[PDB]
Amino acid sequence: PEGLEQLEAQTNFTKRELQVLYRGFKNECPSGVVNEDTFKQIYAQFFPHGDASTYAHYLFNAFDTTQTGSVKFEDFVTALSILLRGTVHEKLRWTFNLYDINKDGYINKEEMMDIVKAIYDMMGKYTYPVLKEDTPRQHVDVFFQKMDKNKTLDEFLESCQEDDNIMRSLQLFQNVM
Amino acid sequence: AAGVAAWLPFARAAAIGWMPVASGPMPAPPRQERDALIVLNVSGTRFQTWQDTLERYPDTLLGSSERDFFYHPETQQYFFDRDPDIFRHILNFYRTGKLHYPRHECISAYDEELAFFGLIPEIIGDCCYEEYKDRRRENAERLQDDADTDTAPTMTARQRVWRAFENPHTSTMALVFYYVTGFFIAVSVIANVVETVPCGHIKELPCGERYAVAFFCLDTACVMIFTVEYLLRLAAAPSRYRFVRSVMSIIDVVAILPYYIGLVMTDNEDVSGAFVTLRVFRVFRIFKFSRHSQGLRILGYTLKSCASELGFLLFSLTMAIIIFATVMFYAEKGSSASKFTSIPAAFWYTIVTMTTLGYGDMVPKTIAGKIFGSICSLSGVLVIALPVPVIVSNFSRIYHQNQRADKRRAQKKARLARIRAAKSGSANAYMQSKRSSSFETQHHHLLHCLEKTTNHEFVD
Amino acid sequence: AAGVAAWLPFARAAAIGWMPVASGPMPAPPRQERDALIVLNVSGTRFQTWQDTLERYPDTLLGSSERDFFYHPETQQYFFDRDPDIFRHILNFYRTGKLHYPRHECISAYDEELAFFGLIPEIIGDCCYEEYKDRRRENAERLQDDADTDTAPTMTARQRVWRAFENPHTSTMALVFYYVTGFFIAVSVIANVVETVPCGHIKELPCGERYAVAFFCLDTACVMIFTVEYLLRLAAAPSRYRFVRSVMSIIDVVAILPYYIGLVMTDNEDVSGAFVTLRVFRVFRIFKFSRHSQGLRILGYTLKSCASELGFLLFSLTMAIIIFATVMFYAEKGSSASKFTSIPAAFWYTIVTMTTLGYGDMVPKTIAGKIFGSICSLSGVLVIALPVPVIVSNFSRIYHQNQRADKRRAQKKARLARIRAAKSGSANAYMQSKRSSSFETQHHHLLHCLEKTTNHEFVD
Amino acid sequence: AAGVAAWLPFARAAAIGWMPVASGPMPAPPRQERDALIVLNVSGTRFQ
């Protein structure tokens, strides 16, 4: 919480970029900390077709390390820096912990059952295929078909790196902000 | 403390007196470094204060390393995008130490600047803190009224019949139930009035001896309707025990008890001791109109709110009654034909005179008694006139705020409609871009990414 | 004077008329030196006025050599760190001469700027001086209420028992004493009511002839309790003589006198002349409830405050009573069976009719008398209705402000807690530095010097 | 919406979670152009 401490010191934001983020961050939450209730208000504005509160709840937990209850600006930026301008390795662990709802690191097709459901839920019911009750399960089933060899963290890292198509999608937003 | 920081040379000069009576240990002076005023441009209006002025409170935004986020370097000034006429009171805090509340500024924006700059409402000066809380109370009450959760069938019939019971103005069955309950209460009390009055010989027999064979049927039908509607209310109350503990259920129980109590009493033996008491209690179904009429609820609320004032009314009334009854009894006792036999006998005269009612059955017949009777009348006027305005004032305030609150709910529904309209417009704007601004281009790309991560497309 | 200084050439031109009728002594003109506007930057907002404008009042901060302390040389401007929207009214004074009070500005900050710049509240213009004093009075009352010294055993038991007597809601003995005193007063007045009412033969004998052998014991026990509690109050009053002169002690003396007076009277001979008077005076123990109930104290305060209004009430009441009694007596005199024998006899009818009481035993029976009786009733309504609202308004205001005052005391205790918390935090901050800001470094050095001048060390 | 516009990098960072469970179609980022404060002088009193 200095401005120079979170400078280009394992934080991928410059001094001017840090100033812009804090002006926007404190604009919505003047107290300097944003909580889960407010964390869903901004996210739901970007996706008005459905409700993003279900996905924001899992997103907030990933941002809120140590389950403090409120996510501060110091560790809010380092989450943005890892996700936006971070390296390959840091992005995958952050996403792995986003799917890993519980404490220990494992994915068992029930923990991320809600994750894919939240992605489909936040589109509302207005799409061309009119969706389906079992369409989130099909997306999970095909997702496990490419990494789940037998029944982990090491598997997730090697599977994403094996397919270059997901590789070029992770680095989508580093060039523009 | 750090607030009085310009007086450090004064304190250091005071420490010189310790040296003659001291044992010099070479206390190692800190040997500090060595003051130009800085600019605080809050959206156009530049504010200039010395840096030492801000640093004397190193736990807020202005005095901290936090303001380095708002430093705009090429102009060598701190640029904040906040209110220019509210940051004026922020700077005054760093000089004196007490915040001042602007009587002309909205309190929802004043609190926004206090939270932004790190100040707290606990440090505002005592000069304006009473009004700050008063204006904070009105804003707080506005939030509570607007967030009362008045929204009104995924589960069993209990909720969808309780919503009709609680709100009889909706649907079509709720209104019918409301009307039939009101009609039954009215006909019950009217019929009671009829059998109390004589209708017709051996004697002027009332309507309760030759008649009242069908009046009993009407009374038992009304009691049965009351009991069954109470049971239906019980079958839809999530707070069944608490709902029973509520005042409305207590009134319903009091209304329905007398018929069953009388039936039990007449099942075994029969006496007239509790007959008149039960007949008196039978009229308590009049208070069941509280649900039907909002006026009764408002009256109950205003009586419960100023309960202390009614207690003082009763205490002062009893005090004056006792004093004046004693005076009149001891002043109008030796008369030839006097009805002031005792202080309790003078209680009736005292309460008649105090309320400016007047009957003439008991009148003073002595020069001493008439003066104290007039003084009793004036003192009764004075005593009763004190708590009357406060009851009426509270009643009017409650009725106006419960007349208000209705428009508060109306603006909430319109506000949600505007939010939904914006959501529909934002969704429609994306489709128009798909068929064929600065931020809108990037925002639609996020939706485009969401489309192609689930291989689905938004359509109209 | 110096206020009209731009009109000096006008005055010098007027002096030309003296020269034809003068005897030129060579009056030695002063031959002065010879005007650019100066900048008054009060914390960012620069204010520009001519130097001659400020110099016309050479007894304040702006027009003096005192403002040379606030001259900041390299910018060639005077920099003050004061309120920018209150210094606006300071400059307007130097033009016209009358200060203007901002209705939207806190008076505790307005007075701060007036004291800072040398102005005084005696020079504010008559246009806004009535409201300035009114807002000053409210601020003054806030200070007085907040500084009432409500703090509550280094000396004898007198103070530690008077604190229980004055405040019966604290401790456990004070509450017991309060409850027992209230119970004794209530039982005394109730027992008096009982012996006044008949209980039972030769005659309808009341409860004071066959009974009242134990009633005398109860009365003397209550009087003894009152006397001993009065003595205990006397044994703990630092203002013993002044406390006796107080209204509460007078009421206590009036309550306790009748028993001893009656005992003295019955010790030697016995007559009934003062028996009824003493029995009437016995009930004056009712007013002892003033200590118990705050409502009685508030009522007494509001009657004492508007004592002039009660005097006008009494004067107008007597005026109307006399006029209407005379009119009714001379208008209803020649009736067959008339009770209007005289104006004093018509006083009863007039006071009954004016208060809208009505008895019907003494009524007019003439066309002339009925019209004046109706006019008497209307005039009584008008006369009584004038001072009733002011009594109720003052009572409500006093009750609300004593309901307020309580929260004023509550915020004072919280404010002292914050001050003590800051003192504890400042002391703790020094220890943390000792175990391991800008001003904090020098401040801790002063404490370090204080440690080593007495070879002692602060510890947790 | 456009009201919360300074949180666009936050929303873009949130979209990273979709990539592991997606099928990357090359969503064609807009490739925007790239912020000095402007003056709004309403009759003498400049607003920035």
Residue numbers in the entry:
A (entry chain H): 36 to 186, 191 to 216
B (entry chain B), C (entry chain D): 2 to 35, 40 to 157, 163 to 210, 215 to 450, 472 to 495
D (entry chain A): 2 to 35, 40 to 53
Which lines from the publication concern this structure?
Modulation of voltage-gated potassium (Kv) channels by auxiliary subunits is central to the physiological function of channels in the brain and heart. Native Kv4 tetrameric channels form macromolecular ternary complexes with two auxiliary β-subunits—intracellular Kv channel-interacting proteins (KChIPs) and transmembrane dipeptidyl peptidase-related proteins (DPPs)—to evoke rapidly activating and inactivating A-type currents, which prevent the backpropagation of action potentials. Here we report cryo-electron microscopy structures of the Kv4.2–DPP6S–KChIP1 dodecamer complex, the Kv4.2–KChIP1 and Kv4.2–DPP6S octamer complexes, and Kv4.2 alone. Thus, our data suggest that two distinct modes of modulation contribute in an additive manner to evoke A-type currents from the native Kv4 macromolecular complex.
The structure of the Kv4.2–KChIP1 complex reveals that the intracellular N terminus of Kv4.2 interacts with its C terminus that extends from the S6 gating helix of the neighbouring Kv4.2 subunit. KChIP1 captures both the N and the C terminus of Kv4.2. In consequence, KChIP1 would prevent N-type inactivation and stabilize the S6 conformation to modulate gating of the S6 helices within the tetramer. The present structure of the full-length Kv4.2–KChIP1 complex reveals that the C terminus of Kv4.2 tightly interacts with both KChIP1 and the N terminus of Kv4.2. The C-terminal cytoplasmic S6 helix continuously extends from the transmembrane S6 helix and terminates at S450, which is localized at the bottom of the complex. Although the residues from G451 to G471 are disordered, the following second cytoplasmic helix with a short loop (C-terminal segment: S472–D495) fits into the hydrophobic crevice formed by KChIP1 and the Kv4.2 N-terminal segment (A2–R35) from the neighbouring Kv4.2 subunit. In addition, the cytoplasmic S6 helix (around S450) is captured by KChIP1 directly and indirectly, through the hydrophobic interactions between Kv4.2 (Y444), Kv4.2 (H479-L482-F493) and KChIP1 (H84) and the electrostatic interactions of Kv4.2 (Y444–K448) with Kv4.2 (H483–E486), respectively. In the Kv4.2–KChIP1 complex, KChIP1s bind and sequester the both N-terminal inactivation ball and the C terminus (amino acids 472–495) of Kv4.2, which would therefore result in preventing N-type inactivation. Moreover, while S6 gating helices adopt a more flexible conformation with weaker interaction with T1–S1 linkers in the structure of Kv4.2 alone, KChIP1 stabilizes these structures and enhances their interactions in the structure of Kv4.2–KChIP1.
